[PDB]
Symmetry: D3
Subunit: 150 residues, 6 copies
């Protein structure tokens, strides 16, 4: 369905580096529709829940501390296959291994400063969207450009 | 000082046209810092208050109707002379008269579909920021970039 | 030979979305030479001979009606290995599976609105070029650029 | 009216320099609609009727020979005030005096290789369009985009 | 003459901010030819001579100290009217007053962090070129794209 | 470590084509730091030493002739995994086989005119940097960007 959604966060490094607009632009050019958007400084609570699946992993700590270190631009995008697509557009975890053309491939070098984060499955997307956004913050009236879908 | 702030809004046409990232990128590249950001569908009240100075102008009804017809991406940018600079970057009210290089100049043709709106003075900016953003949505921590400011 | 040619069409969706220049620019930047160009609204017969290989397939009907639904910008580009290179630049049939960096990968989300079409072999290209352009509409003189070719 | 039209030609230098897509993209992004497009090598008669107003001027001869020296991409764009707007987007006769942001300002350095030509009045445009395009080569159906026009 | 030259320096702020390529690209797109290029950390001696005309002015000190604070990319560009043109492309001293489309207008906010510096006259250009570059560092064989000049 | 360096060279075709800024910008945007930069016309000796590994290859003579036929912009970039990353960003030897998004993929069509050259290993990089740059031309002071490196 063309109403699938995903959660993307331009991390503190992406924001500090002035990449918010560039990133949003990539998803707009693709045809995806912004249904949620805000800048905030994530609270430890938020980050911990966001990255709950990594509570164990040794890098969990610094990650939580990093995402809460400064402003982040949280976004929700809607469109057909947007979850998988946005990940393809982001690249892979390691920016050095990300293909040119992808966001990490074009802009990053370090795993811990990998610019943006995106939901890895519809299940996770739904969970993270609910986490970062109040329902009234998400559009209900979505208007994709009439030339994008059959 | 370098703490001046202005209110900018990508209107429904700018949003429908996928110009959000492009616009945000222009202000990021300029060196202004994003201190507030959110997408929302304006209410009649918000819209009428935002444009209160024009309540007796003939175009007011259509303007309020249009600004409330879809999502708007509201933002606040901070930096030296940001209010006058943002206006220069936007162009003039009529996009056809706006210079190539300005946002309306590069992207618009109709006064009623002029893509973005920005505060016209520090006074208007203070009033507009207050209308659209709660204090808690605006960053307080803004370390000036040593690369942008002497 | 450096005079290979391929047929590319910015489909009705690509034209309506204002992607004609962006697409042409990618081929110009690559070093391919525009030897034919025109905008037209395809007739049913043209569309049908163009997609003749799919006349028995289920999506054929919807494809032909779509191609004829609005203007198309038909082009012929010349250069070494332009047929296969132009396809690599386009992506794969499904824009969602097309890599960031490719035309469909950067701009599309639906197989039926996949922006551009390109010949898939030298044979198909010669055939398609003959279908869309009269000889007089194609450049005959193309001195290879010494900066692009040994 | 929103149906005003103007004639623009990417001159032989603009075409040879691979600026066709970049130029078209600027007009598409602005919101103007491509209603006519084709690449051709101008005949002496065409060039001469096109620049008829300069037939008595000294540079006329060199101008006509240049316009006919290689392919040109002729275009017709439609929209509110497109004639004057398209000229503002082009710059002024001398690219060196053309403002950054304009086509000549960004890409040229010589009056005789000034990249693109555009009609300078509605009268001239209608005349020029009739010179370069047969009616059948121009779109008749142009429903204004609701995002570009009130 | 098409062999006029000018000296441009991407200052430490321009380099620190990752604007070297963007700036060089603007001059290449314009048609100007790079005849000298190098990155170095300016010595006080160099900066003082470079900015000799301001030895008096109160801002002289900090300026010298700023240009010597980090790497700078020194460049020499050749083309018709390149001295005046490059200044027009740079903007005015104050980035806030520089027009969008110009380098300072697009990227800066502070007079002391104004990204790039360019010769203000052929006389000064010649002096600065001689100052920053050894004759053997400057091209003698200059090849402008044959489509730029009459 | 994050101090790895690689040698990159915009070949004469890349320079003639005005691709210098674009290429430098790609590496700047990626987060790699420019530690050396200069434009020069290679000598037969430099060229033969640079490509010594290919001295018995059939294409060696034409390659040496071409690389010495005009200016080259030589550069050294520093950062984690810069050598392999730079290669990924360049593409593969044959531009036609290089992926959209890579430099050769976006801009080239001929193996002999493949725009840029980059070290293929840390060993080759150390050798190449030493060939083209004196120690005094390479920055020694490189404070890692806190935004790019954990
Ligand atoms: C695996 C890993 C990750 N990270 C950082 C980067 C992204 C986040 C989450 O890691 P991940 O969930 O495995 O990667 P990925 O899906 O690509 O990233 P996110 O989109 O979830 O941020 O933590 C890190 O610092 N070190 C590591 O070793
Ligand atoms: C003058 C005018 C304007 N408008 C639209 C455009 C901007 C808003 C507000 O008008 P304005 O306040 O005078 O223009 P301006 O400052 O340039 O735009 P904003 O940044 O305030 O939106 O109304 C319209 O629809 N018709 C008109 O005749
Ligand atoms: C296979 C397929 C295709 N299409 C659309 C997409 C491209 C065209 C032609 O299909 P194709 O010939 O198999 O793919 P491809 O070469 O990538 O497309 P063109 O470049 O020829 O348009 O039809 C569709 O609407 N539904 C489908 O199931
Ligand atoms: C005046 C002039 C002009 N030209 C070239 C540039 C544009 C065309 C037409 O000149 P023009 O008609 O006066 O300027 P302009 O409208 O800006 O150009 P076009 O858009 O019509 O090409 O001729 C030239 O080579 N030498 C000259 O002295
Ligand atoms: C006038 C002025 C200048 N500056 C900085 C900016 C550029 C240089 C040189 O100033 P300038 O020579 O008057 O301006 P301009 O030509 O635009 O700049 P340069 O291209 O010469 O760097 O010093 C500053 O810090 N404060 C000031 O008040
Ligand atoms: C293989 C080959 C190559 N070349 C040109 C292209 C790059 C250089 C060096 O070849 P290479 O070393 O194998 O390719 P590659 O690493 O991709 O390119 P460089 O970054 O070293 O220039 O020679 C050529 O003209 N003809 C050929 O057949
Ligand atoms: Mg993850
Ligand atoms: Mg106003
Ligand atoms: Mg096909
Ligand atoms: Mg004229
Ligand atoms: Mg000066
Ligand atoms: Mg090699």
């Amino acid at each position: 369905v063309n109403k699938e959604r995903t959660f993307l966060a331009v991390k503190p490094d992406g924001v500090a580096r002035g990449l918010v607009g560039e990133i949003i632009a990539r998803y707009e050019k693709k045809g995806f529709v912004l249904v949620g958007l805000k800048q905030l400084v994530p609270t430890k609570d938020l980050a911990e829940s966001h990255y709950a699946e990594h509570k164990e992993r040794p890098f969990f700590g610094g990650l939580v501390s990093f995402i809460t270190s400064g402003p982040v631009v949280a976004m929700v995008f809607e469109g057909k296959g947007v979850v998988a697509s946005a990940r393809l557009m982001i690249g892979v975890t390691n920016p050095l291994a990300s293909a040119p053309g992808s966001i990490r491939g074009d802009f990053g070098v370090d795993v811990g400063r990998n610019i943006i984060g995106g939901s890895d499955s519809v299940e996770s997307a739904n969970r993270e969207i609910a986490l970062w956004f109040k329902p009234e913050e998400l559009l209900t009236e979505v208007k994709p450009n009439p030339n994008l879908y059959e």
